[PDB]
RNA sequence: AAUC
RNA sequence: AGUAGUAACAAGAG
RNA sequence: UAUACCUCUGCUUCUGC
């Protein structure tokens, strides 16, 4: 992935029910 | 039509975040034209305007008109005031000794011990200094030499001993001499044989003449200050005057400043003498503590402050009192030493620059009016502005064309000691056990006062007390420029705070260009400025990479050294184009020889010559780095590594770079204007010393590296060395019987 | 025959009257004054003067020599040089074209031993050449302004010591009084001479280049997890404010530097793991995937024999033997028996000041070492008792006694401090009080011995004492003797226990010091942000709240309080003072419930407090939670979250709907209710407190946190939110 | 001793606004002579390269960029003649190399100039330069703009299709060694503008955790383009791109040079004090003052006959009015 | 002493502070709106927005400035060979003849 | 590669 | 686990 | 004239 | 006076801490 792509960012902590 | 407004950025981004865009540092700084006499006389008048209600007396020494504001009547208005009460200073100083235990005697010791070790040559490392002998500004190194040679005639050889103490002992003694003789070179004709029609030629030889001056004249010259105007001073509409000091005073200032510097380092609430990241690191912690210590459920307020008429108010007689308090435990010889510098400033004389130029517009003529001939002309011919000034100057004006300026600190020089007096005010912290607590920071004239109290109504009452406290020390807070706000953001010495000191790229922007040392040096400096700005002043890699682009541009046009393949026409470019064709390893060629620019973000720290060395041709690298090339010359330890830089705030500090010594590391021709003036004679004087020094360095190679020590003769040293060298070379068998006897014969004559 | 020439050139000079008098009257001291003499004024606009000068015909100045005459007067109709001599050089002036000519068609000089002379620079390139680059990460970076070494040295020395070493190499005969320093660096001098043997380069250049690779270049720079010189030289490419880049510098790295980073790595892991339920499970997870430059933490802990408490704890957790080997500069100890406990004391010293020092209690034994010499040491709370040592060098035995006395923290040692010592830095920073006292008494040791005491020597088989002079004497130092001869398991909550149930180390035994690494610590784990600093974690956490503010705010308003205890907010807890962490949760959980139940919601305040509600709550005696004006966090006076107001860490702008988290601005436009813009903060500012009317002059001045806590339900009060916003609040 | 000539007082002029609005605008012509660079290895350099492809070209393809490159290249050659040919009168052309969208080197000529005798000793010593410059602008339209200029009709051109009349603006001007040098170093207008906006790209890149350059300018999958308050429309605010907001600052930084003097410095300095006091009110940090009218006299005595100062004074009063309206939203917060 | 001096000092000496409110910030430069004064003239060294360059597509090589200025005028010969002065605007102290 | 636009 |  | 802006340059000297 | 349509000069007619 290229630094300009949004998919470059790390799989961040997401909230779930 | 859509009407663009640039300020509308401030709607989206806050002022501090984008403060860089409020600094026009792509533009030209203000310069001064013609005379600075009108600017100096203004200062002379304004200095006495704030001290006029003090005590006026006539100096029995000089015979001048003196003014003493100290322990004068207290002000009844917000106009600047030099009327500082001695007790209120001594109390604030006492309060500092209580808060910081045994700092004064500790600082005094360190300075006193340093003074003993300090050599006379310490007075060489200075800028343009006033030379009393010729009554013109000259380099410190020369201005010192002229005084030593002059003192030898009047019989004062304390300089020869090596220490600064005996040389300073000579300076105060030289006032007692009834007449002070000094050399004044005067031309003489001399026939010399030649191949002319009349086989000879006339060569005007210099001859030194013994010229004397009276006791009074020398005393004044010793207390004289030479005035100019501040050029290239940013963020200012109208101009202002500055002054240079003599070689006499400069000796004693160095110690007193070093003394205050020792105090300032240890003081918490001082921006000096710390700098760069160290400065930020301190102010950040100071701000964090001054923030988080405040009473809960109250208000912490930061006064973004500044003092107007700093130098014009502060009196030397207060600075004298400061040293006497600081040197209380130190011995009696040191007390009297530190007391001189202020005593000299207390009875200082101001030189009023060049003068005023008068012109007839119809006739189309002009002529400078020297300062001694200011009242030769009826004052109707001077314009309103100057006419008013010259009348106000009259009661302070001397016949020789100078002004008695007993009050104020025209030149300044006392920055560290002037900071301390400011800190002393910040040390008080409260008056009348009221419900507030103040504490600030000090960088000479610049200050930032924090106030923690119940409510803002109390805070302002607390600030009002600081203002009235500072008036008794001689510190006048600028009601105009100074402003207040709740803690979180403030300004202190062009550094902008907003929950942390914000990046301000525009302040360092002028430094990015070609510094103007030479091709090999400027390249290193150029990249070293770029890499250091990525670190400290937050320049992103994109802007950083562009800063490399924009450098090579300015570099290639300035040194007319465009790429070899590029067909840009020029005298040099013609030989560059041949080198490009001749050379195989063209990537090995430097940018100054029309080679490619291979620099990027990573390799800024590596010299250009080192980066390309492996890629160079074997012939080219030989030429570029020829050991005995004619371009480089006799390199001085400072000449290789260090070079001057002028940032738009503080004094001219010399930064150091990393560059390889090659053909490009050249020097420029000397200013040849001297050839047409009578100063010519100094050229011979220089080349004479040059021979001696260059021959001394041939005998002692370490002289270039580490300063030679010895109170004995410079010839005596050279004799004994060359004697041994010859003897050992003979016994070893490097020297023959033919040469040894000739050597011992020549040395026999000496 | 150089000698003959110099004498004959001295003869020619002395025939001149001016030169004769100068050489007679000028001293060797004054040489430094006549050298700096010239007609040349200082150019106070060199940038301009150069650009101007470059547009002249002959700007440069050649040095009068045969090599200057090798240049032709003109080339292909180009004036290279002029006949007219320069005032300075006394040689033909020339154009910049003359330089370009020389480099093209000039004579080919001798570049033999150039790489050996300019070694320091070539190494700097060699490090970048052999280096490997990692990956760029975008996200906040807290930068500390520490005094670091700019360039790596060959062998470090003070200015004086190096200057003499340089003299011995280049200028032997001038050198002067031979110091011991010569014999210490004798091996370097010999080596440098052989390398700088067959070179034509000027000595002044060699001296300068040597001075670089000996004298230290230490200055303050903003850094973040890399203090090693070979990193600092690349600091521009390492990290910015809002980005970071992994970089492995090539060549060699030091063992000490690896050991330095190895500690902070463990200390960071433990400090974070402590808060999580089953710390060991989390410590083991990270520790495995933690990397120091390139070498993993396990490989470092296995390879290096040494460290601190924190290193051993992790060593055990990974499954490695624990080296209980404490180091105090030159002194290297190893625990035999006893266990001490650190306690901050207000210790008074000889010069007359007081300093907070962490004193060690209980009786202990250690196996000391200092170079060639070895020994065993015993001590108690602020006293030295017994010190056994072997015979080796006089200076190694001399230094070992000084270190052990300072280590013991004996009240006789602190009484010996009679001079000047700096516990505070030039920039108002803190310097390790114990590591400062060690440096003081190492140089000035005359006070230490005198101020300690003396008594008779021991009278045994091989036991014979030594005096101040370090010789077998009768009067030995009070409690000093010389002689002739020289598995564990870890708990859930990170504690090292013997087979007997005896604990030797715990999580409360590691240092609370947060300090920069020398090498670069890289965590090969998707949850690496958790090991970050206070301002890094504070910012990163609040970003996760905003990243899921839609789903979080929704399920909370329905009822479900399952977010309160969410993975994200665990890392945030480890930068709360683990002492009021529960009380903060108590306050926050109450004020949050008071917003969704009462229906006086404020999305900005929801985002502000939700991270504080992970810690199991702790209420007051009478059921009510604790009340606060601001919530304090680890390190710095900057770090706090003002509840009534905005803070340096967290602030909200209603006007623009802009949220500023540690300088970085986010927008809350399209995530706020229309009615919410009106809703006062007074309702969601104190737990079990809601706004009634406006400031009533009758009720009196604004009440403190204490005065608000101790009020019976259904009592009216005055609170000030932020300057000029009075409110009338009543207790529910 | 003759009375000193003081800068006379002027009023606001639309041509300064018009200059701003036009210099900001995009064109199809790249002027900047940005040289080569070392090859990218470190991923920071690769990001640095991409970031430029957006940042540089946004300036390069604008009017101000060419005007800047003209001044530089002219002041470069003008200083070279001034030292080389001191005694000689020389006809210097107003050269500029430009590249179009297709990529063709179009050498431009904006007119001819004449440098007088240049025996420049002091830095401030003046060398009179006489400018003859081409233009499509009829000077009769805005008469009060060109008191200093002397104009002749010299033909016509069909650049668009309408017969656009070519004029020749002739003026006796003057420069010195300093201004000519500071002119050669006017490329650094890029850096002051590019850093300020790369900072905002970094700031936003931190929050989203990837290079937000591409996203800020145009936008991507997740993120929409950044927008800034940029100008007015008959007394009602308008928003504009990041690309425009970049160029508006770059233009300002060029104007800082083109109208750079003691009047600008003095104003810029004293006007910050007021800009901060405004930020205090915007932050609601209850700011206090000791003498405002005195602090104003400092700002107001710097406004005389500098076009940029006089227009900045107007723009400041315009912006102050808009911020003064926004305040009304806050004063009615937490008062129920 | 400081206590004794601040006691005896006149109350007239003070910072006389006031809290800043938006409607205190009067617009800077009152005179710039007055129409009595003359419109500020263009005083830049070169022409900026009004400028007009004559396009001469190069052979991808660098040429002398005189030669360039020549070839550029060779293309636009109609303007280069316009010897008839058609004056439009004149500067107060300037010469139509000398300039042309 | 990038190519800027405007109204 | 710092000082220089 | 013009640059420029509280005072200069628009060449100086033998 | 004169050589002098010649000769020299371009930060060195005051640039501080
Ligand atoms: O780094 P610390 O904050 O833990 O403090 P310091 O300077 O003492 O660290 C040096 C090392 O030495 C150990 N030490 C110090 N003393 C005087 C004692 C000990 N350890 C024990 N068991 N007993 C002592 O009396 C510190 O633990 C540290 O490792």
mmCIF file of N, CA and C in Angstrom, chain C residues 431-515:
data_model
loop_
_atom_site.group_PDB
_atom_site.id
_atom_site.type_symbol
_atom_site.label_atom_id
_atom_site.label_comp_id
_atom_site.label_asym_id
_atom_site.label_seq_id
_atom_site.Cartn_x
_atom_site.Cartn_y
_atom_site.Cartn_z
ATOM 1 N N UNK C 431 18.770 16.118 37.687
ATOM 2 C CA UNK C 431 19.955 15.234 37.495
ATOM 3 C C UNK C 431 20.024 14.243 38.663
ATOM 4 N N UNK C 432 20.265 12.960 38.366
ATOM 5 C CA UNK C 432 20.231 11.827 39.331
ATOM 6 C C UNK C 432 21.123 12.131 40.535
ATOM 7 N N UNK C 433 20.542 12.445 41.721
ATOM 8 C CA UNK C 433 21.325 12.880 42.882
ATOM 9 C C UNK C 433 22.459 11.932 43.304
ATOM 10 N N UNK C 434 22.269 10.619 43.139
ATOM 11 C CA UNK C 434 23.263 9.575 43.515
ATOM 12 C C UNK C 434 24.397 9.542 42.480
ATOM 13 N N UNK C 435 24.057 9.625 41.189
ATOM 14 C CA UNK C 435 25.008 9.584 40.044
ATOM 15 C C UNK C 435 25.792 10.902 39.942
ATOM 16 N N UNK C 436 25.324 11.967 40.603
ATOM 17 C CA UNK C 436 26.037 13.272 40.706
ATOM 18 C C UNK C 436 27.101 13.190 41.810
ATOM 19 N N UNK C 437 26.740 12.634 42.973
ATOM 20 C CA UNK C 437 27.635 12.483 44.154
ATOM 21 C C UNK C 437 28.772 11.505 43.830
ATOM 22 N N UNK C 438 28.512 10.501 42.983
ATOM 23 C CA UNK C 438 29.525 9.512 42.521
ATOM 24 C C UNK C 438 30.617 10.233 41.718
ATOM 25 N N UNK C 439 30.222 11.178 40.858
ATOM 26 C CA UNK C 439 31.129 11.944 39.958
ATOM 27 C C UNK C 439 31.983 12.918 40.784
ATOM 28 N N UNK C 440 31.404 13.516 41.832
ATOM 29 C CA UNK C 440 32.048 14.532 42.711
ATOM 30 C C UNK C 440 33.256 13.924 43.438
ATOM 31 N N UNK C 441 33.049 12.798 44.128
ATOM 32 C CA UNK C 441 34.031 12.173 45.058
ATOM 33 C C UNK C 441 35.049 11.314 44.293
ATOM 34 N N UNK C 442 34.829 11.066 42.998
ATOM 35 C CA UNK C 442 35.764 10.289 42.135
ATOM 36 C C UNK C 442 37.017 11.132 41.859
ATOM 37 N N UNK C 443 36.837 12.428 41.574
ATOM 38 C CA UNK C 443 37.935 13.396 41.299
ATOM 39 C C UNK C 443 38.471 13.949 42.626
ATOM 40 N N UNK C 444 37.609 14.593 43.422
ATOM 41 C CA UNK C 444 37.957 15.188 44.744
ATOM 42 C C UNK C 444 37.666 14.161 45.847
ATOM 43 N N UNK C 445 38.647 13.309 46.167
ATOM 44 C CA UNK C 445 38.528 12.170 47.119
ATOM 45 C C UNK C 445 39.199 12.486 48.464
ATOM 46 N N UNK C 446 39.894 13.625 48.577
ATOM 47 C CA UNK C 446 40.669 14.017 49.789
ATOM 48 C C UNK C 446 39.708 14.283 50.958
ATOM 49 N N UNK C 447 38.550 14.899 50.685
ATOM 50 C CA UNK C 447 37.493 15.201 51.690
ATOM 51 C C UNK C 447 36.861 13.894 52.185
ATOM 52 N N UNK C 448 36.569 12.967 51.264
ATOM 53 C CA UNK C 448 35.829 11.701 51.524
ATOM 54 C C UNK C 448 36.519 10.905 52.641
ATOM 55 N N UNK C 449 37.831 10.676 52.515
ATOM 56 C CA UNK C 449 38.654 9.869 53.458
ATOM 57 C C UNK C 449 38.748 10.588 54.811
ATOM 58 N N UNK C 450 39.144 11.866 54.789
ATOM 59 C CA UNK C 450 39.307 12.741 55.983
ATOM 60 C C UNK C 450 37.997 12.802 56.779
ATOM 61 N N UNK C 451 36.864 12.985 56.091
ATOM 62 C CA UNK C 451 35.530 13.210 56.715
ATOM 63 C C UNK C 451 34.929 11.887 57.211
ATOM 64 N N UNK C 452 35.464 10.741 56.774
ATOM 65 C CA UNK C 452 34.941 9.390 57.117
ATOM 66 C C UNK C 452 35.362 9.009 58.544
ATOM 67 N N UNK C 453 36.659 8.753 58.760
ATOM 68 C CA UNK C 453 37.221 8.289 60.043
ATOM 69 C C UNK C 453 38.291 7.228 59.840
ATOM 70 N N UNK C 454 38.938 6.797 60.929
ATOM 71 C CA UNK C 454 40.055 5.814 60.925
ATOM 72 C C UNK C 454 40.063 5.006 62.229
ATOM 73 N N UNK C 455 40.731 3.847 62.199
ATOM 74 C CA UNK C 455 40.924 2.929 63.356
ATOM 75 C C UNK C 455 42.036 1.926 63.018
ATOM 76 N N UNK C 456 42.333 0.999 63.935
ATOM 77 C CA UNK C 456 43.418 -0.014 63.800
ATOM 78 C C UNK C 456 43.040 -1.043 62.727
ATOM 79 N N UNK C 457 44.048 -1.638 62.080
ATOM 80 C CA UNK C 457 43.909 -2.663 61.009
ATOM 81 C C UNK C 457 43.454 -3.990 61.610
ATOM 82 N N UNK C 458 42.871 -4.906 60.801
ATOM 83 C CA UNK C 458 42.515 -6.244 61.279
ATOM 84 C C UNK C 458 43.755 -7.121 61.516
ATOM 85 N N UNK C 459 43.678 -8.014 62.510
ATOM 86 C CA UNK C 459 44.787 -8.907 62.948
ATOM 87 C C UNK C 459 44.326 -10.366 62.840
ATOM 88 N N UNK C 460 44.317 -10.905 61.616
ATOM 89 C CA UNK C 460 43.954 -12.304 61.287
ATOM 90 C C UNK C 460 45.074 -12.933 60.447
ATOM 91 N N UNK C 461 44.784 -14.049 59.768
ATOM 92 C CA UNK C 461 45.752 -14.830 58.954
ATOM 93 C C UNK C 461 46.147 -14.045 57.696
ATOM 94 N N UNK C 462 45.171 -13.683 56.852
ATOM 95 C CA UNK C 462 45.403 -13.031 55.531
ATOM 96 C C UNK C 462 44.755 -11.637 55.476
ATOM 97 N N UNK C 463 44.246 -11.123 56.603
ATOM 98 C CA UNK C 463 43.540 -9.813 56.683
ATOM 99 C C UNK C 463 44.511 -8.733 57.183
ATOM 100 N N UNK C 464 44.861 -7.775 56.316
ATOM 101 C CA UNK C 464 45.768 -6.630 56.610
ATOM 102 C C UNK C 464 45.275 -5.381 55.864
ATOM 103 N N UNK C 465 44.950 -4.313 56.602
ATOM 104 C CA UNK C 465 44.282 -3.101 56.083
ATOM 105 C C UNK C 465 45.224 -2.191 55.309
ATOM 106 N N UNK C 466 44.676 -1.119 54.719
ATOM 107 C CA UNK C 466 45.411 -0.098 53.908
ATOM 108 C C UNK C 466 44.886 1.300 54.269
ATOM 109 N N UNK C 467 45.760 2.315 54.222
ATOM 110 C CA UNK C 467 45.465 3.720 54.624
ATOM 111 C C UNK C 467 45.100 4.543 53.377
ATOM 112 N N UNK C 468 45.105 5.878 53.493
ATOM 113 C CA UNK C 468 44.711 6.837 52.421
ATOM 114 C C UNK C 468 45.616 6.669 51.193
ATOM 115 N N UNK C 469 46.920 6.471 51.411
ATOM 116 C CA UNK C 469 47.969 6.395 50.357
ATOM 117 C C UNK C 469 47.854 5.092 49.551
ATOM 118 N N UNK C 470 47.025 4.142 50.006
ATOM 119 C CA UNK C 470 46.769 2.824 49.359
ATOM 120 C C UNK C 470 48.021 1.945 49.492
ATOM 121 N N UNK C 471 48.519 1.796 50.725
ATOM 122 C CA UNK C 471 49.681 0.943 51.094
ATOM 123 C C UNK C 471 49.356 0.195 52.393
ATOM 124 N N UNK C 472 49.819 -1.054 52.515
ATOM 125 C CA UNK C 472 49.605 -1.943 53.684
ATOM 126 C C UNK C 472 50.081 -1.238 54.960
ATOM 127 N N UNK C 473 49.171 -0.517 55.627
ATOM 128 C CA UNK C 473 49.442 0.359 56.800
ATOM 129 C C UNK C 473 48.665 -0.136 58.027
ATOM 130 N N UNK C 474 48.873 0.517 59.176
ATOM 131 C CA UNK C 474 48.270 0.158 60.490
ATOM 132 C C UNK C 474 46.897 0.827 60.627
ATOM 133 N N UNK C 475 46.817 2.131 60.339
ATOM 134 C CA UNK C 475 45.573 2.948 60.406
ATOM 135 C C UNK C 475 44.806 2.813 59.084
ATOM 136 N N UNK C 476 43.837 1.891 59.042
ATOM 137 C CA UNK C 476 42.951 1.620 57.876
ATOM 138 C C UNK C 476 41.636 2.393 58.048
ATOM 139 N N UNK C 477 40.895 2.582 56.950
ATOM 140 C CA UNK C 477 39.579 3.281 56.926
ATOM 141 C C UNK C 477 38.564 2.485 57.756
ATOM 142 N N UNK C 478 37.660 3.193 58.441
ATOM 143 C CA UNK C 478 36.718 2.636 59.452
ATOM 144 C C UNK C 478 35.751 1.660 58.768
ATOM 145 N N UNK C 479 36.055 0.359 58.833
ATOM 146 C CA UNK C 479 35.221 -0.734 58.292
ATOM 147 C C UNK C 479 35.655 -1.152 56.895
ATOM 148 N N UNK C 480 36.970 -1.251 56.662
ATOM 149 C CA UNK C 480 37.582 -1.675 55.366
ATOM 150 C C UNK C 480 38.665 -2.722 55.656
ATOM 151 N N UNK C 481 38.647 -3.840 54.921
ATOM 152 C CA UNK C 481 39.581 -4.996 55.088
ATOM 153 C C UNK C 481 40.027 -5.474 53.698
ATOM 154 N N UNK C 482 41.273 -5.953 53.588
ATOM 155 C CA UNK C 482 41.880 -6.509 52.338
ATOM 156 C C UNK C 482 42.312 -7.956 52.611
ATOM 157 N N UNK C 483 42.027 -8.869 51.674
ATOM 158 C CA UNK C 483 42.309 -10.330 51.781
ATOM 159 C C UNK C 483 43.097 -10.794 50.547
ATOM 160 N N UNK C 484 43.553 -12.053 50.549
ATOM 161 C CA UNK C 484 44.479 -12.633 49.535
ATOM 162 C C UNK C 484 43.742 -13.598 48.595
ATOM 163 N N UNK C 485 42.430 -13.786 48.777
ATOM 164 C CA UNK C 485 41.605 -14.764 48.012
ATOM 165 C C UNK C 485 40.277 -14.109 47.602
ATOM 166 N N UNK C 486 39.699 -14.560 46.481
ATOM 167 C CA UNK C 486 38.476 -13.975 45.850
ATOM 168 C C UNK C 486 37.249 -14.401 46.668
ATOM 169 N N UNK C 487 17.179 -21.230 40.827
ATOM 170 C CA UNK C 487 16.039 -21.125 39.874
ATOM 171 C C UNK C 487 14.841 -20.480 40.580
ATOM 172 N N UNK C 488 13.973 -19.812 39.811
ATOM 173 C CA UNK C 488 12.832 -18.984 40.312
ATOM 174 C C UNK C 488 11.624 -19.201 39.391
ATOM 175 N N UNK C 489 10.416 -18.902 39.883
ATOM 176 C CA UNK C 489 9.151 -18.867 39.100
ATOM 177 C C UNK C 489 8.436 -17.531 39.338
ATOM 178 N N UNK C 490 7.627 -17.100 38.364
ATOM 179 C CA UNK C 490 6.977 -15.754 38.325
ATOM 180 C C UNK C 490 5.467 -15.912 38.534
ATOM 181 N N UNK C 491 4.853 -14.943 39.222
ATOM 182 C CA UNK C 491 3.405 -14.918 39.560
ATOM 183 C C UNK C 491 2.606 -14.307 38.403
ATOM 184 N N UNK C 492 1.280 -14.269 38.554
ATOM 185 C CA UNK C 492 0.318 -13.637 37.610
ATOM 186 C C UNK C 492 0.572 -12.125 37.575
ATOM 187 N N UNK C 493 0.759 -11.507 38.748
ATOM 188 C CA UNK C 493 0.922 -10.036 38.926
ATOM 189 C C UNK C 493 2.409 -9.653 38.901
ATOM 190 N N UNK C 494 3.231 -10.387 38.141
ATOM 191 C CA UNK C 494 4.659 -10.065 37.863
ATOM 192 C C UNK C 494 5.431 -9.916 39.181
ATOM 193 N N UNK C 495 5.719 -11.041 39.841
ATOM 194 C CA UNK C 495 6.583 -11.136 41.047
ATOM 195 C C UNK C 495 7.377 -12.444 40.989
ATOM 196 N N UNK C 496 8.674 -12.384 41.311
ATOM 197 C CA UNK C 496 9.611 -13.538 41.255
ATOM 198 C C UNK C 496 9.674 -14.200 42.637
ATOM 199 N N UNK C 497 9.206 -15.452 42.730
ATOM 200 C CA UNK C 497 9.062 -16.216 44.007
ATOM 201 C C UNK C 497 10.000 -17.428 43.974
ATOM 202 N N UNK C 498 10.721 -17.669 45.076
ATOM 203 C CA UNK C 498 11.576 -18.870 45.284
ATOM 204 C C UNK C 498 10.677 -20.087 45.537
ATOM 205 N N UNK C 499 11.280 -21.252 45.792
ATOM 206 C CA UNK C 499 10.565 -22.519 46.110
ATOM 207 C C UNK C 499 9.973 -22.435 47.524
ATOM 208 N N UNK C 500 10.534 -21.576 48.382
ATOM 209 C CA UNK C 500 10.153 -21.415 49.813
ATOM 210 C C UNK C 500 9.004 -20.408 49.961
ATOM 211 N N UNK C 501 8.535 -19.815 48.856
ATOM 212 C CA UNK C 501 7.486 -18.777 48.858
ATOM 213 C C UNK C 501 8.045 -17.403 49.196
ATOM 214 N N UNK C 502 9.370 -17.241 49.096
ATOM 215 C CA UNK C 502 10.099 -15.970 49.347
ATOM 216 C C UNK C 502 10.140 -15.168 48.041
ATOM 217 N N UNK C 503 9.546 -13.969 48.036
ATOM 218 C CA UNK C 503 9.558 -13.034 46.870
ATOM 219 C C UNK C 503 10.876 -12.251 46.891
ATOM 220 N N UNK C 504 11.542 -12.156 45.735
ATOM 221 C CA UNK C 504 12.845 -11.441 45.565
ATOM 222 C C UNK C 504 12.643 -10.175 44.717
ATOM 223 N N UNK C 505 11.628 -10.147 43.844
ATOM 224 C CA UNK C 505 11.318 -8.991 42.958
ATOM 225 C C UNK C 505 9.811 -8.918 42.690
ATOM 226 N N UNK C 506 9.304 -7.699 42.473
ATOM 227 C CA UNK C 506 7.891 -7.398 42.163
ATOM 228 C C UNK C 506 7.765 -6.227 41.203
ATOM 229 N N UNK C 507 6.533 -5.879 40.821
ATOM 230 C CA UNK C 507 6.212 -4.790 39.869
ATOM 231 C C UNK C 507 6.389 -3.421 40.541
ATOM 232 N N UNK C 508 6.395 -3.377 41.879
ATOM 233 C CA UNK C 508 6.577 -2.140 42.688
ATOM 234 C C UNK C 508 8.059 -1.961 43.043
ATOM 235 N N UNK C 509 8.942 -2.787 42.470
ATOM 236 C CA UNK C 509 10.411 -2.753 42.709
ATOM 237 C C UNK C 509 11.128 -2.094 41.519
ATOM 238 N N UNK C 510 10.479 -2.013 40.348
ATOM 239 C CA UNK C 510 11.036 -1.371 39.115
ATOM 240 C C UNK C 510 10.977 0.153 39.275
ATOM 241 N N UNK C 511 11.848 0.868 38.554
ATOM 242 C CA UNK C 511 12.022 2.342 38.625
ATOM 243 C C UNK C 511 10.819 3.049 37.994
ATOM 244 N N UNK C 512 10.354 4.133 38.624
ATOM 245 C CA UNK C 512 9.246 4.991 38.123
ATOM 246 C C UNK C 512 9.807 6.058 37.171
ATOM 247 N N UNK C 513 11.123 6.044 36.924
ATOM 248 C CA UNK C 513 11.816 6.944 35.960
ATOM 249 C C UNK C 513 11.394 6.587 34.531
ATOM 250 N N UNK C 514 10.820 7.557 33.812
ATOM 251 C CA UNK C 514 10.526 7.488 32.355
ATOM 252 C C UNK C 514 11.626 8.265 31.622
ATOM 253 N N UNK C 515 12.523 7.558 30.926
ATOM 254 C CA UNK C 515 13.721 8.126 30.250
ATOM 255 C C UNK C 515 13.815 7.604 28.811
#
